[PDB]
Each structure stands twice: as structure tokens, then as C-alpha cells.
Amino acid sequence: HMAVKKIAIFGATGQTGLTTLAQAVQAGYEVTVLVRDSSRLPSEGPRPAHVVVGDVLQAADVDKTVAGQDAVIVLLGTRNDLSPTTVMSEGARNIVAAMKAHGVDKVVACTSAFLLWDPTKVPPRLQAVTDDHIRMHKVLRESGLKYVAVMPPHIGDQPLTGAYTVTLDGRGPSRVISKHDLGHFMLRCLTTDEYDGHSTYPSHQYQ
Amino acid sequence: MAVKKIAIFGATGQTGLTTLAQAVQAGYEVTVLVRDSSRLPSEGPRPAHVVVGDVLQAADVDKTVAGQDAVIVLLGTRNDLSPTTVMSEGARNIVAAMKAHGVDKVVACTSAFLLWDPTKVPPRLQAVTDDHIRMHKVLRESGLKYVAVMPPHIGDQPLTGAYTVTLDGRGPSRVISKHDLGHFMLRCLTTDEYDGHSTYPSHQYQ
Ligand SMILES: NC(=O)c1ccc[n+]([C@@H]2O[C@H](COP(=O)([O-])OP(=O)(O)OC[C@H]3O[C@@H](n4cnc5c(N)ncnc54)[C@H](OP(=O)(O)O)[C@@H]3O)[C@@H](O)[C@H]2O)c1
Ligand SMILES: NC(=O)c1ccc[n+]([C@@H]2O[C@H](COP(=O)([O-])OP(=O)(O)OC[C@H]3O[C@@H](n4cnc5c(N)ncnc54)[C@H](OP(=O)(O)O)[C@@H]3O)[C@@H](O)[C@H]2O)c1
Ligand SMILES: CC1(C)CCC(C)(C)c2cc(NC(=O)c3ccc(C(=O)O)cc3)ccc21
Numbered sequence: 001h002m003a004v005k006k007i008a009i010f011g012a013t014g015q016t017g018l019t020t021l022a023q024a025v026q027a028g029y030e031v032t033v034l035v036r037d038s039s040r041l042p043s044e045g046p047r048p049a050h051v052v053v054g055d056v057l058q059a060a061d062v063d064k065t066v067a068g069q070d071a072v073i074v075l076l077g078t079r080n081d082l083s084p085t086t087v088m089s090e091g092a093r094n095i096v097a098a099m100k101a102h103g104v105d106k107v108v109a110c111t112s113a114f115l116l117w118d119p120t121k122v123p124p125r126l127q128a129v130t131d132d133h134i135r136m137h138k139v140l141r142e143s144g145l146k147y148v149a150v151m152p153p154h155i156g157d158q159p160l161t162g163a164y165t166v167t168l169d170g171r172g173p174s175r176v177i178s179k180h181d182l183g184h185f186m187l188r189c190l191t192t193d194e195y196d197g198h199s200t201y202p203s204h205q206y207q
Numbered sequence: 208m209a210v211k212k213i214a215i216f217g218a219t220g221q222t223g224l225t226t227l228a229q230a231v232q233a234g235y236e237v238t239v240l241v242r243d244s245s246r247l248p249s250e251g252p253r254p255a256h257v258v259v260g261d262v263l264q265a266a267d268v269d270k271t272v273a274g275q276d277a278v279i280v281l282l283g284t285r286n287d288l289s290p291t292t293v294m295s296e297g298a299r300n301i302v303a304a305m306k307a308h309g310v311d312k313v314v315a316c317t318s319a320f321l322l323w324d325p326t327k328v329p330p331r332l333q334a335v336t337d338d339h340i341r342m343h344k345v346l347r348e349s350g351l352k353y354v355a356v357m358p359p360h361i362g363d364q365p366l367t368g369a370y371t372v373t374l375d376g377r378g379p380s381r382v383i384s385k386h387d388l389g390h391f392m393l394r395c396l397t398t399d400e401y402d403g404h405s406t407y408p409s410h411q412y413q
Contacts, residue, residue: 120380
């Protein structure tokens with residue numbers, strides 16, 4: 001019945017991206033992914049409708065990915081690399097410009113629950129990556145787009161439940177969210193305007 | 208000192224716009240150098256003088272620095288991904304103009320990266336950070352009374368006037384509102400105590 005039907009997913013080959021992609025395909029979305037390496041997509045796994053091979057640091061590649069979409073999901077990250085980086089904030093800059101040029105309004109983007117923390121209490125080893133989450137959140141907040149700021153705590157390997165808590169504009173009662181539940185939530189944000197302009201912290205107790 | 212007339216370079220950026228607004232509200236006679244005056248707000252506080260030009264033309268810079276009591280430098284080129292000298296070349300023009308016109312006080316903003324180990328700088332920001340360093344040395348070698356403002360993350364929180372200022376080192380917090388940052392650049396015009404120092408404004412925003 002397709003109010004939102006065509007979506008771009010950035011970071012679809014990552015931990016959360018892969019299950020977000022699987023869930024999106026099963027839910028009937030027509031998914032376009034931007035991937036650096038097509039081999040990162042599972043050969044047996046569910047196939048997106050459209051693959052763009054390129055880099056989020058090329059405006060041209062982002063433009064090709066955002067063209068014609070109804071909404072954008074952002075799950076960019078640096079895997080376990082804790083080095084100083086601007087890939088997420090610069091990627092978000094390109095995504096914002098592409099959305100504005102192509103008339104896409106809705107962006108659901110994952111940073112981190114550390115953006116709800118006292119900034120001085122972030123573990124030093126995570127500060128470089130958190131610094132770029134901060135830069136990225138500022139890019140998206142200042143864009144004027146309909147931006148849902150997803151700020152998860154630890155991403156785990158527990159099941160899909162669809163039963164997690166969503167805390168608005170503050171830290172939630174648990175310190176973990178499964179990658180499957182986080183992906184479920186990213187997609188849920190496509191079906192409602194209630195989180196637009198808010199920060200959201202999904203979390204759950206797996207039992 | 209008795210600072211009434213200031214030039215602002217970089218007035219159309221995010222920090223420059225609120226520094227300009229606050230300077231006009233406080234009563235400074237502000238001159239700005241802009242490439243396109245349509246980039247200045249049509250409403251609210253407006254500067255007293257507008258020079259149309261850019262910081263890479265020594266004549267435009269001389270026209271902007273002439274007659275001033277102090278200079279505020281809010282130049283940026285963080286669009287740049289690879290070696291660039293716009294900021295340091297601009298500071299060279301500004302220093303030459305201040306010397307020619309007898310202007311002694313410069314308050315310039317670079318980045319708190321200049322107070323961190325260089326391995327803290329993200330690779331795609333190293334070029335702009337390298338030119339921040341070059342601009343800082345151009346101003347440190349100046350012999351002019353130079354306050355180096357080296358802020359951390361610049362946020363959009365409302366003005367508080369309650370931030371802390373750390374001297375020659377990093378402070379406790381890691382963010383400064385663009386409004387508090389502009390407030391501090393203006394405060395540097397009212398005192399000698401920061402001259403020849405690096406300054407790190409920061410605050411925790413409830
Ligand atoms: N407990 C946690 O792990 C945790 C907690 C809170 C927040 N976070 C944050 O949550 C977000 C998602 O985490 P995650 O574990 O699901 O992600 P991830 O496994 O790190 O995957 C990151 C995705 O971004 C892609 N990517 C990186 N650079 C790219 C580039 N230049 N161009 C195009 N794509 C690029 C990656 O592609 P490749 O496959 O080519 O590498 C990958 O698909 C991250 O930002 C993370 O920092 C994680
Ligand atoms: N973003 C951060 O979190 C952060 C943190 C620490 C430090 N800083 C640094 O603080 C400084 C200012 O902050 P910002 O973010 O507000 O900068 P910004 O938004 O990028 O503003 C750039 C300003 O620089 C002027 N400019 C650039 N090249 C010029 C040229 N040839 N001639 C004349 N003017 C020129 C521009 O004037 P015209 O447009 O009229 O040409 C413009 O007003 C920057 O250097 C930045 O790197 C930023
Ligand atoms: C850089 C990266 C991807 C490396 C891997 C780990 C180390 C896994 C990681 C962990 C977090 N954050 C959290 O795990 C977390 C947990 C609870 C709260 C909270 O209680 O608010 C907040 C944040 C953020 C980024 C990262």
C-alpha cells in the first residue's frame with residue numbers, strides 16, 4: 001500500500017545494516033543500497049532491488065543512491081576501527097545535499113547514545129568515533145530535513161522481538177539493543193512522523 | 208586599550224554571524240569583508256561598514272583593517288580536503304595591514320586540535336588543521352597582541368556567558384556554543400589578560 005516504498009540504505013553491509021536490509025526486503029520495501037564492495041552483500045542472503053557500487057565520500061555516488069527514493073536509512077560506521085574519522089559526518093553532508101536536490105525529506109540515521117551523555121563521561125577510547133557522531137548529528141539537525149536521530153546503546157546479537165522500549169530525548173532503562181531490534185526500529189520510523197525532530201534511544205531486556 | 212571599531216573577517220559563517228550580531232548589539236562599530244553582501248542578514252543588527260571583496264586581495268584587506276582598533280578573525284575553509292593555504296595567506300595579508308595601519312590587537316579562531324596530539328586529527332581534516340597551524344604561527348610570529356582562540360566542538364546552544372576559559376591547555380568540557388564563542392571573542396577585546404596566550408573556551412550545557 002506503499003506510502004514509503006523505495007528506500008536507500010547506507011551501511012547496509014554492516015552489523016545492523018544486514019538485518020535491516022533483510023527485514024526491509026521481507027516487509028516489501030524496494031531497497032537501494034550503496035556498497036563499497038558487492039562481495040559484502042551475502043550471496044545467499046536477500047537481494048536489494050538496486051545496488052550502487054561506490055563510496056559515501058563521493059557526492060556523485062550518494063546522489064545516484066538517493067535519486068528517486070521516498071526515504072533514507074543511515075547505518076554508516078567504521079566497524080571496530082576507533083581511529084579519528086569523518087566518514088559519517090562527511091557522508092551525512094553528502095546525503096543531506098542529495099536529499100535536498102531530489103526532494104527526499106525523511107532520514108532515519110543512527111549515531112549513538114553517547115550523544116545523550118555528559119560528554120566528559122564518554123570512554124576515552126570511544127571519543128574519536130563519538131566526535132564524528134556529534135559532527136554527523138549536527139549536520140542532520142541543521143539540515144531542516146525530517147530527521148529521526150536514533151541513538152542506541154550497545155548493539156548486541158539477541159533476537160528480533162519488536163518489544164523494545166523507545167525512550168524519547170533521553171537515556172532509556174536498559175543498556176543494550178539487539179541489532180535486529182535496532183533495524184526493526186529504523187524501519188518503524190518510516191511509518192510514523194512521531195519521532196521526527198527527536199532523539200530516540202531503543203533498548204530492551206532480552207529474556 | 209579602548210576598542211570601539213573592529214573588523215570581522217569571516218562574518219558570514221556560523222560563528223561570525225552571531226559574533227557580528229552580538230558586536231553590533233553591544234555597540235561596536237563593525238566593518239566586515241564579504242564576497243557577497245546578500246549573504247548578510249537583511250534584518251536585525253547590521254554592521255556599520257561593508258567591504259565587498261575577499262581576504263586573498265591585500266587591498267581589500269587593507270581597506271578593511273584601516274581605522275580599526277582590533278581585528279577578529281573567523282576564517283574557515285573546512286570544505287578543503289587536501290593542502291590549502293587560504294587561511295594562512297589571509298592571515299599574512301591581515302598582519303601586513305595591521306602593521307601598516309598601526310592596529311595592534313588580533314583575536315583569531317583556529318581549533319582545539321592545536322592542543323591535542325596530532326594523531327587526534329581525522330585524516331581528511333589534516334589539510335585544514337595544517338593551515339590552522341600555519342595561520343597560528345603567522346600570528347604568533349607577528350609581534351602583535353594576539354589571542355589564540357582554540358575551541359572544541361562548536362554547538363548551537365543558546366548564549367550563556369557562563370563558559371570557562373582554560374589557558375594554554377584543554378579545559379574540562381568539550382563543547383562551546385557558537386554564541387558563547389562569539390561572546391568570548393568580544394570579551395577578548397576588553398582585556399589584556401589573554402594576549403600571547405592560547406585560550407580554550409568550553410562549557411557544559413544543561
Ligand atoms: N554497540 C555498538 O556497536 C554501537 C553502539 C552505539 C552506536 N554504534 C554506532 O552504530 C552505527 C552502526 O553500527 P554497526 O555495527 O551496525 O555498523 P558497522 O558494522 O560498523 O557497518 C558500517 C557500515 O557503514 C559502511 N561504510 C563505512 N564507510 C563507508 C563508506 N565510505 N562508504 C560507503 N559505506 C561505508 C560500511 O561498509 P563496508 O561493509 O564496506 O565496511 C558498513 O556497511 C555506527 O555508527 C556505530 O558507531 C554502535
Ligand atoms: N565546526 C567546528 O566545530 C569547529 C571547531 C573548532 C574550530 N573550528 C574553526 O573555527 C573557525 C570558524 O568557525 P566556523 O565553523 O563558523 O567557519 P565557517 O562557517 O566555515 O565560515 C567561513 C568564513 O570564512 C570566510 N572565508 C573563507 N575564505 C575566505 C576568503 N578568501 N576571503 C574572505 N572570506 C573568506 C567566509 O567569508 P565569505 O563566505 O563571504 O567568503 C566565511 O564567512 C574555522 O576555521 C573552523 O575550522 C570549527
Ligand atoms: C565505536 C564502537 C562502534 C566500537 C564498539 C563498541 C565498543 C561496542 C561501541 C560502543 C558504543 N556505545 C555503547 O555500547 C553504549 C552502551 C550504553 C550506553 C548508555 O547506557 O547510555 C551508551 C553507549 C559506541 C560505539 C562503539
